[PDB]
Subunit: 177 residues, 3 copies
């Protein structure tokens, strides 16, 4: 095809990339405890990870991108919950998955408010798998929502910053503005 | 990946990509029902998804190796879901299905892609034993995985034709790769 | 400030990549057997895959990231295959992976490597007559993380040496 190559000034994001990568490892291990029926420890890890992510932390993605990421976070939570509690709680887990199906239907219609509401419903239903650990399950869902938003903002800025530089260069070259 | 991004201004290529991603979410949720032993609902979703995906593709070439790499991943997804949903009761049947997947990977490594495709169909067929009243549902899930792998490889092939941005890796002050 | 591009066909690099991709498929199917409680067959495939990988200096941080991912795949397979009866052992193993991540975050890679080995060793307890097989699974995941880190380290020296050789040929032997 045809290639146009720009030389731009680097924006370094490595320490931020590693920080989100580490938060993702932490959330994964909280979910590994949930896969073993250990909601107390899963919740404690999630609370500390959320705390650390907020303490150490322009252009926002489109709402559709936010919901794509949050759907993935809900999927991770449901999959962990299903391994950890499917021996006993398939009734409640089926309800939670049904709600996630409604979230995808809303997402497909571009009704992102209904998508977000259905996803919150899905996570609330999981409280029924460990009713003495509902705060922990709620913290796991908050962490997944927080990591989804954080990754989407980093993925947005990763390409927005160079596209803005290119756009501004072409604007100067073509219109002398 | 993380070094490439595709401009999606054509809107019809936007809508085609979102349609494939959304059919993937649908198939994932059908597999989530299978992980809970709900083969009837898993199959109902798989058939609705296949029907809609085919209809919306109407009126709209990757190597055999590329097709099979994607189909192997679809088989992997189905096996993993069935193992969570039915491993407590049907490890005997699930073991047979995985053995057939192993044979498919051997055929794939030998570049015998016809044998690979056949061995994957045998793996999926053997899965019927975990839920003998829901054998049509289980075949519907496998067809959806194959259909999604075929569609994604096609969309991934029509990728070079679309405008795109790429970042080069800097090897030195004056030397880059892409 | 003129720009020149050398176009090179790296058939050997692609073949190396596919060899690692296929070994990933083999390792995954070993883990699939573990998810079904079939530790004997899992370890057999692991041993056979490690042998084939052997017949056919990494950066520390990259190898450690790969090892942590390998440990995650092993803990996830083991939780599915044995979580119904061996949760006490598996919980201890996950605790060690958490220690490994903390050490990794501090770039204390000796402590991270020790914790990961401890995590995998604790997994042995889920199938006490098959701990050789479970150890074999973990060795394969570490060998794969070493092979990917080695591949990444030599990713540019390979085509650079090929280019250097082609330029030398054209400049001095034509």
């Amino acid at each position: 095809g045809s290639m146009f190559t720009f030389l731009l000034n680097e924006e370094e994001t490595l320490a931020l990339e590693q920080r989100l990568d580490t938060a993702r490892l932490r959330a994964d291990d909280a979910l590994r405890f949930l896969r073993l029926g250990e909601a107390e420890e899963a919740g404690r890890i999630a609370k500390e990870t959320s705390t650390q992510l907020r303490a150490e932390g322009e252009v926002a993605p489109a709402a559709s991108v936010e919901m794509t990421g949050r759907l993935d976070g809900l999927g991770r939570l449901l999959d962990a919950a299903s391994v950890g509690y499917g021996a006993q709680s398939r009734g409640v887990l089926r309800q939670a998955v049904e709600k996630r199906v409604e979230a995808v239907t809303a997402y497909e219609k571009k009704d992102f408010a209904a998508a977000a509401a259905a996803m919150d419903g899905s996570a609330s239903l999981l409280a029924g798998i460990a009713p003495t650990r509902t705060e922990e399950l709620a913290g796991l869902w908050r962490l997944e929502k927080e990591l989804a938003t954080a990754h989407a903002a980093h993925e947005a800025a990763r390409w927005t910053r160079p596209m803005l530089s290119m756009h501004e260069q072409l604007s100067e070259n073509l219109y002398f503005q």
